[PDB]
Ligand binder design. Structure first.
Ligand SMILES: *OP(=O)(O)OC[C@H]1O[C@@H](n2cnc3c(N)ncnc32)[C@H](O)[C@@H]1O
Lengths: 152, 989, 82
């Protein structure tokens, strides 16, 4: 069953979480949804932290989970609602044998090094190509206005 | 379509119209044979009502063909069904293309087969005696099949070809290179450039290393311009079938192994012995008569062995036990065997008529003798099998009156009243499953009959559209058997209805038969059957394929569903790559479906109610959605309501979606400016988009334009004339309606860079007032998708859109076979494979009802009728897992009582540890976790003194409803593997 | 026996065509399943393959079914229609 494997992965991950994950908790009423705090390790994103939410479909691992940021961000690679078109969770590249730890590592290296894979919003790509500094200002303002402080 | 044109006008003869002949005739009528001619002089008796569904008790002592024709003509009113009253004649065969002799005598079989062989008329000799069924085919000395295999022609995308004498070309990456084999016949049905090679004569192809396809001389042709599509052409194969009298002495049997070939040769010898016994003594052997069986086996003994394959040495002496067993039960005719053999025979008739698929290599011998009582149990007796006027006289002769009563005292559950469901219901009605007060039958289905369903359904009529499918199926079953007590239900069998189908309901049934259209539903029903320990009969068809399996608890392996396919049945799509660069027909069809869903279905409710009080362009992606949706027709100061087939409006959708949008994409992302990772490394990776201009010589563009106009008129509720008429001349006469309106129809009205609010403050006010004006209009209902109403013009529009966008993005065009996979215009199951799987399920029912049987008695089945593939193999033993002291299978469960006071979670853990010797680390109830060994000590010590029912009430918030006599929850234990699964915990509340 | 030299066998696709494979008798059936899955583009759980009319178990080795060089193996895909 998907629920048992999700629980086992969550327990194994919490027994030794990566440094970029804090207060990773799940609701015992619905264990197929998680809340976690991501710590980017590359400036200027490393200034604050983001709470990300990942939802597991009932047919896990035969269907990639969806990851949505609770806090709004201004990124070309992140959807407006918070969804991420991650290469690993793509249906054309998804593999049930993979583990959520690998997905978390991929997301961490993606947020520590933003990459222009697909312009989810064309205006975002146009503004990033024409004036990256305004995009940097918008991203830092979004982090400062919606993000949470970095704990220890 | 051309294949069924031959079937539409063909004429076929069916003789010996018994149960088997009735099945062949029904299948032929369902498939649409143009003219079906029946022939049966004998009157109906009791001994053939057990297998023929067209004859009731009121048809006794009446001619079988005359009685059957009344219902046969009613099955499909477009099929002309006539009855030949007299005797067969040589000049009558001239007007028939195929003849079928079902259960005819050997001498008549030889005579008619020789007469048809002389005149070149396909001949079939299907015959069912007992639990074994013989089939014979003879399509003539020179028969040519135009489709040797059941497969659409291969299609590949060539990326570059060479104008050289060897003619070595290149093609895009794909499995077609491993599919295209040397010596194949291919045709270049479509190519940009090479006008000589476009639609050229068929030519061979040769393959070498690195996929080097060698075509031949092409130097004199024009220079290479662009890539195209290469199509495979199958080479017709000639087949030589010997005459019946000659083939009887040299039986060429279709089988899958040498042992099966020997078994089928023994069955052929037994059939010949039965025929000779009938000729010599004038009567078939009596039901389970010992002396008749001894006479038959002795006749087979003096039947010299070299009568089969004289050139082949005798592999082994004939098994006397097999011939005796066939002779004993040969006196009766069974509904499952009749269904299976008639299905195969009708498929062979379709092969002969339409020349499609490889014909059967003369002989076939279906065996089902495992349905008899075990070798250590008691055998049926002539006293038990004596005729007594029951409609199941033949089945009783095969099995006995006690087995018939056992079938009567049975309650079963049928899930899904589809084609397989209808055929299963017919088999149950004929067999007598629950045909009494002590038994019954249940039918479960959710859908309602539609126009596209009943066209090939057996139990449905033209007036049944809109009625519940289960109710109509139950009425038809009661008509087939008055003694049957069928209770239709409209509640589906899914997780959202466990209370309706709880333990109370499933305690009534003795078994479940599943005929479902999805893997998810099959998995759920198998899970329910495992939970309640009820035998499951599962079947499925696709094209000419067919599977039929039985799952007996603690005997056979549980139903291992293909979880990948279950997930892929209904899954979200990462349209990011699809929106950026499509690569498959699935990508473009999903794009079209999503575009329809958002623009027409979702937009109606979102833009009217949601936007009035919730989020808007300030935090949504509407800045581009509005620009995509508004200028499709124009500004017009109001949404128009005029006639929609004008030139300007019809061409606008094609220009914006495929011409102007692609032009804007190309200007924004040129093929040399594709920023894959920041600055181009290989710009335009493996593909290059190309805008297309509306050329009047291309029929597909004009077809798409007219289909879009018709679709818009249909959805807007406005009349539309037949623009395919002389109005096409006006359309072609003026291909440029307004050349000067280029600027307004490209992007907004004056914007090229947007910048920092260059449009002005009044622009947003104008947009808001335009949106408010556009809000008032027709009440566009978010109506449900029309799955069977192909006349709405949606299907043509979406197919044209996909086939044009794929070609625009460099993808080869999608064929009709690939598009038929989608739910829209999904291909109905062929009647032959449906009847075959239903007969196999009935054969397995004969053993499930028979009580305790070993695994070596049950037999899963898989069939492919196009290539004459059929296998009956015993299923695997249950997967025995082990963990320390514990050892279990897939059917095992951990039942633990709660006690008079509900044992607390700590008490439950202690009980598990003391009883089964294992300590649980993780324990959860479905989706909510209850206990975890890794939890903090204070939280664990808080949870331990709580009773399990109290804990689940606290967490889930739902008290145990009535009927929840047991509670199911998952548990894991320390030292276990990540992949292994422990038995579910049944907590007896 | 060590049967070090691999042998060539034919696996029949559902759509008429067939392809050749080079396998060992010590090689597991699941390895052949994943090979034909990669070549045919269909997940190995969606289908199963059979030899001489009887199915092949994933855990069992190829040698137990008595495969011979240039043998034919048909892949049976599980069916949904009903
Ligand atoms: O398409 P089809 O004729 O092959 O399907 C047979 C019937 O099965 C119904 N169906 C599908 N799924 C279920 C469940 N889970 N329970 C009951 N009936 C079900 C379809 O309505 C179809 O008619």
């Amino acid at each position: 069953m998907a629920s048992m494997r999700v629980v086992k992965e969550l327990e194994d991950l919490q027994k030794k979480p990566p440094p970029y994950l804090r207060n990773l908790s799940s609701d015992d009423a619905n264990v197929l949804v998680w809340h976690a705090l991501l710590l980017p390790d590359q400036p200027p994103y490393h200034l604050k932290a983001f709470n990300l939410r990942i939802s597991f479909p009932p047919e896990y691992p035969f269907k990639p989970p969806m990851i949505k940021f609770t806090t709004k961000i201004y990124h070309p690679n992140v959807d407006e609602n918070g969804q991420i078109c991650l290469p690993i969770i793509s249906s054309e590249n998804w593999k049930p044998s993979t583990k959520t730890s690998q997905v978390l590592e991929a997301l961490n290296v993606l947020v520590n090094r933003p990459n222009i894979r697909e312009p989810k919003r064309m205006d975002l790509a146009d503004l990033l190509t024409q004036n990256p500094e305004l995009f940097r200002k918008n991203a830092e303002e979004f982090t400062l206005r919606f993000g949470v402080d970095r704990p220890s | 379509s051309p294949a069924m044109q031959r079937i539409q006008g063909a004429r076929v003869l069916v003789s010996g119209l018994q149960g088997l002949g009735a099945e062949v005739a029904k299948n032929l009528v369902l498939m649409g044979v143009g003219s079906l001619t029946l022939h049966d002089p004998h009157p109906t008796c009791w001994s053939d009502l057990a297998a023929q569904f067209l004859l009731s008790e009121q048809d006794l002592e009446r001619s079988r063909a005359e009685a059957s024709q009344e219902l046969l003509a009613q099955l499909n009113r477009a099929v002309q069904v006539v009855v030949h009253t007299g005797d067969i004649t040589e000049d009558l065969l001239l007007d028939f293309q195929v003849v079928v002799l079902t259960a005819a005598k050997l001498e008549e079989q030889l005579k008619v087969g020789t007469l048809c062989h002389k005149h070149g008329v396909c001949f079939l000799a299907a015959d069912t005696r007992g639990l074994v069924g013989q089939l014979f085919c003879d399509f003539g000395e020179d028969f040519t099949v135009q489709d040797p295999t059941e497969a659409e022609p291969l299609t590949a995308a060539i990326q570059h070809i060479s104008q050289g004498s060897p003619g070595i070309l290149t093609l895009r990456k794909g499995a077609n290179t491993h599919y295209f084999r040397d010596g194949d016949l291919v045709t270049f049905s479509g190519i940009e450039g090479m006008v000589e090679l476009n639609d050229c004569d068929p030519r061979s192809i040769h393959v070498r290393e690195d996929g080097s396809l060698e075509i031949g001389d092409t130097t004199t042709f024009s220079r290479y311009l662009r890539g195209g599509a290469i199509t495979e052409v199958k080479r017709p194969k000639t087949v030589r079938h010997k005459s019946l009298d000659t083939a009887l002495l040299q039986p060429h049997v279709v089988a899958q192994s040498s042992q099966e070939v020997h078994h089928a040769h023994c069955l052929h010898q037994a059939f010949c012995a039965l025929h000779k016994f009938q000729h010599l003594h004038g009567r078939p052997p009596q039901p389970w008569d010992p002396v008749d069986a001894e006479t038959v086996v002795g006749l087979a003994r003096d039947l010299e062995p070299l009568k089969r394959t004289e050139e082949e040495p005798l592999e082994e002496p004939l098994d006397e036990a097999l011939v005796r067993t066939v002779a004993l039960s040969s006196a009766g005719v069974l509904s499952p065997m009749v269904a299976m053999l008639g299905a195969v025979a009708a498929q062979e008739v379709l092969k002969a008529i339409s020349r499609k698929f490889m014909p059967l290599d003369q002989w076939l011998y279906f065996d089902a003798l495992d349905c008899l009582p075990e070798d250590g149990e008691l055998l049926p007796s002539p006293e038990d099998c004596a005729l007594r006027g029951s409609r199941y006289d033949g089945q009783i002769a095969v099995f006995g009156a006690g087995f018939q009563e056992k079938l009567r005292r049975q309650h079963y559950l049928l899930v899904g009243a589809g084609a397989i469901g209808c055929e299963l219901l017919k088999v149950f009605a004929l067999v007598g499953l629950g045909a009494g007060n002590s038994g019954g039958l249940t039918v479960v289905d959710m859908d309602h009959i539609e126009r596209s369903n009943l066209s090939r359904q057996f139990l449905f009529r033209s007036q049944d559209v809109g009625r519940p499918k289960a109710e109509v199926a139950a009425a038809a079953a009661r008509g087939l058997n008055p003694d049957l007590q069928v209770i239709p239900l409209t509640y589906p069998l899914d997780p959202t209805t466990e209370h309706i189908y709880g333990d109370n309901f499933f305690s009534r049934v003795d078994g479940v038969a599943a005929a479902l259209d999805s893997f998810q539903a099959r998995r759920y029903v198998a899970a329910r059957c495992t939970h309640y320990l009820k035998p499951l009969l599962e079947a499925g068809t696709s094209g000419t394929w067919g599977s039929a399996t039985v799952f007996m608890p603690h005997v056979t392996e549980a139903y291992r569903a293909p979880a990948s396919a279950a997930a892929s049945e209904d899954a979200p799509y990462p349209v990011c790559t699809v929106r950026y660069f499509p690569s498959t027909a699935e990508h473009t069809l999903q794009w079209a479906r999503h575009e329809f869903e958002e623009l027409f279905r979702l937009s109606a409710e979102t833009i009217n109610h949601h936007q009035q009080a919730h989020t808007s362009l300030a935090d949504m992606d509407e800045p581009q959605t509005l620009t995509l949706l508004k200028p499709v027709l124009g500004v017009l100061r109001v949404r128009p309501q005029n006639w929609q087939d004008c030139v300007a409006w019809a061409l606008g959708h094609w220009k914006l979606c495929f011409h102007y949008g692609i032009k804007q994409l190309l200007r924004h992302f040129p093929p040399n400016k594709v920023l894959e990772d920041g600055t181009p490394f290989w710009s335009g990776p493996k593909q290059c988009p190309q805008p297309l201009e509306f050329d009047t010589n291309q029929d597909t563009h004009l077809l798409y334009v007219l289909a879009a106009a018709n679709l818009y008129a249909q959805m807007h509720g406005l009349p539309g004339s037949q623009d395919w008429t002389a109005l096409r001349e006006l359309l072609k006469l003026l291909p440029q309606p307004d050349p000067q309106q280029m600027a307004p129809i490209f992007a907004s009205n004056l914007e090229l860079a947007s910048a920092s609010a260059e449009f002005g403050p009044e622009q947003q006010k104008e947009l808001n007032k335009a949106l408010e004006v556009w809000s008032v209009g027709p009440p566009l209902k978010p109506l449900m998708f029309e799955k069977d109403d192909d006349s709405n013009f949606h299907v043509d529009f979406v197919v044209a859109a996909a086939s044009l966008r794929c070609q625009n993005y460099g993808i080869p065009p999608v064929n009709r076979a690939q598009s038929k996979r989608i739910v829209g215009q999904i291909i109905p199951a062929i009647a032959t494979t449906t009847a075959a799987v239903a007969g196999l399920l009935g054969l397995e029912l004969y053993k499930v009802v028979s009580g305790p049987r070993p695994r070596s008695a049950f037999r899963h089945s898989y069939l492919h009728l196009a290539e004459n593939y059929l296998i009956r193999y015993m299923p695997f033993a249950p997967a025995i897992q082990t963990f320390h002291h514990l050892k279990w299978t897939s059917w095992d469960r951990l039942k633990v009582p709660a006690g008079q006071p509900e044992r607390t979670l700590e008490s439950l853990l202690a009980h598990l540890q003391e009883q089964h010797g294992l300590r649980v680390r993780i324990l959860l109830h479905g989706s909510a976790l209850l206990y975890a060994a890794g939890w903090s000590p204070e939280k664990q010590a808080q949870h331990l003194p709580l009773r399990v029912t109290e804990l689940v009430q606290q967490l889930t918030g739902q008290a145990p409803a009535p009927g929840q006599r047991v509670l199911v929850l998952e548990l894991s234990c320390e030292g276990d593997d990540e992949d292994t699964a422990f038995p579910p915990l049944h907590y007896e509340l | 026996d060590k049967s070090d030299e691999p042998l060539s066998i034919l696996v029949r696709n559902n759509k008429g065509r067939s392809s050749t494979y080079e396998v060992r008798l010590t090689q597991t059936v699941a390895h052949l399943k994943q090979q034909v899955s990669g070549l045919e583009g269909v997940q190995d759980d969606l289908f199963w393959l059979t030899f001489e009319g009887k199915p092949l178990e994933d855990q069992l080795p190829l040698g137990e079914y008595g495969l011979k060089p240039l043998s034919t193996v048909f892949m049976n895909l599980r069916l949904r229609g009903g």
